[PDB]
């Protein structure tokens, strides 16, 4: 029922390694029987029910069962369960390629669109046909036989290369040892949480809750250099081999499909359309930020020269890679009076969670309720039920996995577990999402205290959750966040604007000790500090976007040399010799290949919607919030990204709001 919750979450999280492997074989056998039955139908025998409906019914049942098998590798605390989940992901990814390249299915779908009356079917069903045909041509099913076999074998190879690329980074356990003197200027609540060694030193891992605080606060330059070297050499040997094979395969596949480069191949499925649009977008933005980067680098060198003189260190007259985050932090303290370690005292995780849920219950017209004794994959995971405030319709559920642990996904993402699409019996499946982040642990007898950047990450990932829950389509392939890659980051970055509003920050903050709110002056300075270090921070994102474009455009290039090239030309901070940042670039194997520009590309759309609609008539306006849910989130992937922006803005988007928020133009 659309107004109940019991029985609609069919996800089990107590699977053993043997059950994961058994369910994987069963899922492949049962799914292949559906594709085989459709393939056996005569061409003049296919209809809407025996072909389109039969495939749509198995796509939703497959992706839900697939979720229980390929998700434990990211969250489970049992390494054997994670290994069985990764093997299930490898086996199911090759199966996806086998089914996607069935010529008999392609012929019968093409024949169905030609004979069926497209006017008597839902417009989303029309989109299902043309997308399926377009996906078949992007697999070469209109090409001769032997080239299809080459594409298939190379697709299966790239599948295992991408899985092994992220598997190496997720299971890395590299750590360094430092003494108390080598960890100068680090606070005691960080030092007292590290593992002690036999010689009274401390173990520091390369994970985010350890790497960033060292690179931002530790006043020992050699300590930051050793950390930056180890961080940008993770899996350097094995992942360079993978990149040296994956990138030529992507080019070789794009050639056989008729495309010049792999970047052109993936750009056709994005709102940017062409690579020449991405180049002009990145280059024009890089030129606007060039004066800001020069002024910020000059201020950083002055900070480094004075500190080397005060502390008696040697001064090399340059900004090394291990100096960037350290003096960016000083720029925030000196130019904007912002102490992140003091400001986090006003952001205990329970107050931030309460304010986060309350902000979007009121804005989106939703009702959140935490479930007790919830079936979860880890003890620290909580479950919430989402209802429509007016009708009481149970839209979906989401999990909160907030704290880091061994073997857990170390970045910050949102996972779609169940799509909010239609079921074969006519009912609607309850959407399910999971917010997976690694926030600060509760230490020193205090609750978890989040820095402002962690609060902004909390709002970003919750935007993906709201997109997954509010999306309601007919087909699973259009549900959730199955939109253009350069558009999926619009709902997430849109909700980041609420951590830069004074009244919104006042509802998110309460001191962990005495419960007092943040002072008015400090609250004003926090909002005014939104553009601190924005020159170099954005230039580094352009560097990553240019490297991602270059590695998928030019053939026979050294990944480390191309990254060091743009670091010196664009960012002005040289890459450390001996490192290999592209070997750690997980986006190149996590669906963002040739598409990392989409973050900056999406920010133009989110800033335009926030400034032109929310910021003009109240950012908590329920009318504007409901219009944002129905036009941006609810359609999911059933409409083009540009079409949904047109319906919300009643015009075309432009960079005026984007450039104004960046202090440009």
């Amino acid at each position: 029922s659309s107004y109940t919750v019991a029985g609609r979450n069919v996800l089990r999280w107590d699977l053993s390694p043997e059950q994961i492997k058994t369910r994987t074989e069963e899922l492949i056998v049962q799914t292949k029987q559906v594709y085989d039955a459709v393939g056996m139908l005569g061409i003049e025998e296919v209809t809407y029910e025996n072909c389109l409906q039969a495939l749509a019914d198995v796509e939703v049942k497959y992706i839900v069962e697939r979720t229980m098998l390929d998700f434990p590798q990211h969250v489970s605390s049992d390494k054997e369960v994670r290994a069985a989940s990764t093997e299930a992901d490898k086996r199911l990814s090759r199966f996806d390629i086998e089914m996607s390249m069935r010529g008999d299915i392609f012929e019968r779908i093409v024949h169905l669109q030609e004979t069926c009356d497209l006017g008597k079917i839902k417009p989303e069903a029309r989109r299902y046909l043309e997308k399926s045909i377009k996906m078949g041509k992007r697999n070469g099913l209109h090409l001769p036989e032997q080239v299809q076999n080459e594409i298939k074998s190379m697709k299966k190879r790239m599948s295992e290369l991408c899985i092994d690329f992220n598997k190496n980074l997720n299971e890395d356990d590299t750590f360094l040892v430092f003494s108390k003197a080598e960890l100068g200027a680090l606070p005691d609540d960080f030092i007292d949480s590290l593992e002690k060694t036999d010689d009274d030193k401390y173990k520091i891992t390369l994970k985010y809750p350890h790497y960033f605080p060292v690179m931002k606060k530790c006043c020992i330059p050699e300590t930051r250099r050793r950390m930056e070297m180890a961080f940008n050499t993770r899996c350097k040997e094995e992942n360079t081999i993978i990149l040296q094979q994956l990138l030529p395969l992507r080019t070789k596949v794009a050639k056989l499909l008729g495309y010049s480069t792999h970047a052109d191949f993936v750009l056709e499925m994005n709102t940017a359309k062409s690579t020449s649009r991405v180049t002009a977008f990145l280059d024009d933005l890089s030129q606007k930020l060039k004066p800001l980067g020069e002024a910020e680098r000059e201020f950083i060198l002055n900070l480094k020269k004075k500190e080397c003189k005060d502390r008696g260190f040697e001064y090399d007259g340059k900004i090394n890679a291990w100096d960037l985050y350290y003096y960016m932090t000083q720029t925030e303290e000196l130019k904007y009076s912002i102490d992140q370690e003091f400001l986090k005292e006003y952001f205990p995780i329970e107050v931030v969670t309460e304010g986060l849920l309350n902000t979007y219950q009121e804005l989106l017209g939703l009702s959140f309720e935490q479930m007790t004794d919830a079936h979860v994959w880890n003890k620290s995971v909580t479950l919430y039920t989402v209802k429509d405030k007016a009708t009481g319709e149970v839209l979906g559920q989401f999990y909160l996995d907030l704290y880091p642990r061994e073997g857990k996904y170390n970045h910050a993402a949102c996972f779609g577990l169940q799509p909010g699409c239609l079921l074969p019996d006519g009912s609607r499946m309850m959407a399910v999402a999971a917010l997976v982040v690694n926030f600060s642990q509760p230490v020193a007898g205090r609750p978890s205290l989040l820095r402002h950047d962690e609060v902004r990450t909390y709002f970003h990932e919750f935007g993906h959750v709201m997109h997954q829950i509010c999306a309601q389509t007919d087909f699973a392939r259009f549900s959730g966040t199955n939109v253009e890659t350069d558009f999926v980051e619009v709902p997430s970055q849109m909700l980041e604007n609420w951590v830069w509003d004074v009244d919104s920050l006042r509802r998110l903050s309460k001191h962990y000790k005495d419960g007092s709110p943040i002072a008015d002056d400090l609250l004003e300075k926090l909002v005014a500090s939104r553009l601190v270090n924005t020159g170099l921070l954005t230039l580094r994102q352009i560097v990553l976007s240019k490297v991602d474009q270059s590695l998928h455009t030019n053939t026979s290039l050294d990944a480390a040399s191309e990254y060091a090239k743009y670091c010196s030309e664009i960012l002005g901070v040289a890459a450390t010799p001996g490192t290999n940042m592209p070997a750690t670039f997980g986006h190149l194997a996590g669906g963002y290949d040739g598409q990392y520009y989409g973050y900056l590309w999406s920010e133009v759309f989110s800033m335009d919607m926030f400034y032109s609609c929310f910021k003009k008539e109240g950012i908590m306006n329920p009318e504007v919030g409901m219009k944002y849910r129905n036009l941006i989130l609810k359609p999911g992937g059933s409409l083009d990204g540009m079409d949904m922006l047109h319906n919300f803005l009643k015009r075309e988007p432009n960079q005026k709001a984007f450039l104004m928020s960046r202090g440009l133009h």
């Binding site: 993402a413 949102c414 997976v436 669906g591 990392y596």
Partner: peptide, 6 residues
């Protein structure tokens, strides 16, 4: 994965 730039 479905979340956070580098």
């Amino acid at each position: 994965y479905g979340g956070f730039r580098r």
